[PDB]
Ligand binder design. Structure first.
Ligand SMILES: C[S@@+](CC[C@H](N)C(=O)[O-])C[C@H]1O[C@@H](n2cnc3c(N)ncnc32)[C@H](O)[C@@H]1O
Ligand SMILES: C[S@@+](CC[C@H](N)C(=O)[O-])C[C@H]1O[C@@H](n2cnc3c(N)ncnc32)[C@H](O)[C@@H]1O
Lengths: 212, 213
């Protein structure tokens, strides 16, 4: 059984989690509005950066109070950031056996670095990037991470995959490769292995230790 | 002016991003995102979108006849067809910049083992097709990948949304839970501040992404 808490200034953005595993009760997902932990009438969560620069930075005081209430020493705190360590399939396998994930979603130019630093004195913290592009907020990264982790959780149960096919065997004058219709398991496995390695050298040569 | 059409068996998944578009951009005709239920193009009373894989094995494959009809209706010769897949070419910031000036994106969201390969192969004989991965992990469906792609592209279109790693950022208060903002940032020596930030970027990249060096 896993608990996932997501903290955000846009809780409505996390509604896509509800095409659930949540229904099966293996995981509980709760979404929290960061503005709940403010105290001023304007409920301000951001301020200009020290040292100059474009944009705004999320204030540490509000985040500190929220994480104080939600986290324990056993929590794995996940902080999405384009400057993070890479989130990969290996990471997903690792987090699939955790009891409690808390995902802190940033906006603007991100969260004051002292929030993560303070948290690390009490719990395990992971700052992670989901890919080499820039999003407007951490909410889409939270949805990606939750999906990748949940399909590996017990109870739900290298190379690029080659192409797949289904009926009919001929469509618009395009045929399913005849080996797949041949019923020869050894020949099919061999062909599928070759397609995978061929697609990998063309699209992701780095996976096989080549340039680019 | 960009049109984005998304085709999916879970249309409600895309509904946050539609509502995140500013009214001013929509009213000015800068952007229009539309979402379509794939089952609209099914042929049978059971609204079937998948079938068993040729050659055997576990899982299911999405049907070519259903997808072919959907893309026939939605795409034109000017369309850039985006097909998310963990076996695709990598989607990067460079890709996002390129797609930000397109007139028409269509995103085909897969499920299960993916879409019968003849769909993309056929489409590529009359339009541009791009099979892309958003990262080195496996998702259950293409919808989350569509959200990522739409966000990364549209924040580069003016008025819609919006090497080395960036270093840490700080704001008020100057002291918090025993931790002070680095004094250099409050110094008013802006050449020195820029050099400090550059070195912070270098250290963070060596630690977290040595591949970038
Ligand atoms: C415009 S980004 C920049 C802020 C970022 N934290 C930084 O320090 O560079 C705003 C937020 O979107 C999220 N984000 C953007 N790109 C991301 C990526 N590639 N991976 C994970 N999260 C990302 C993070 O939550 C981030 O704080
Ligand atoms: C379980 S995946 C595997 C299917 C995939 N098309 C294949 O043949 O390898 C099912 C669907 O989720 C989406 N998906 C999973 N991982 C993805 C990734 N890393 N990047 C983009 N889309 C992904 C794709 O739409 C894919 O068709």
């Amino acid at each position: 059984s896993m608990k996932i808490d997501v903290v955000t200034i846009f809780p409505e953005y996390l509604q896509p989690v509800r095409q659930s595993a949540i229904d099966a009760g293996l995981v509980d997902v709760a979404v929290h509005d960061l503005r709940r932990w403010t105290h001023d009438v304007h409920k301000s969560v951001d301020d200009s950066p020290y040292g100059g620069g474009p944009g705004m930075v999320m204030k540490p005081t509000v985040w500190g109070d929220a994480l104080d209430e939600i986290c324990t020493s056993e929590t794995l705190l996940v902080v999405p950031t384009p400057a993070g360590y890479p989130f990969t399939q290996e990471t997903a396998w690792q987090w699939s056996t955790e009891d409690h994930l808390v995902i802190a979603c940033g906006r603007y130019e991100g969260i004051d670095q002292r929030v993560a630093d303070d948290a690390a004195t009490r719990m395990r913290v992971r700052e992670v990037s989901i890919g080499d592009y820039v999003l407007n907020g951490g909410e889409a990264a939270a949805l990606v991470i939750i999906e990748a982790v949940l399909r590996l959780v017990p109870g739900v149960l290298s190379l690029l995959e080659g192409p797949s096919y289904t009926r009919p065997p001929s469509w618009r004058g395009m045929d399913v490769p005849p080996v797949l219709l041949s019923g020869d398991h050894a020949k099919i496995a061999a062909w599928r292995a070759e397609q995978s390695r061929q697609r990998t050298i063309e699209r992701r040569p780095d996976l096989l230790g080549f340039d680019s």
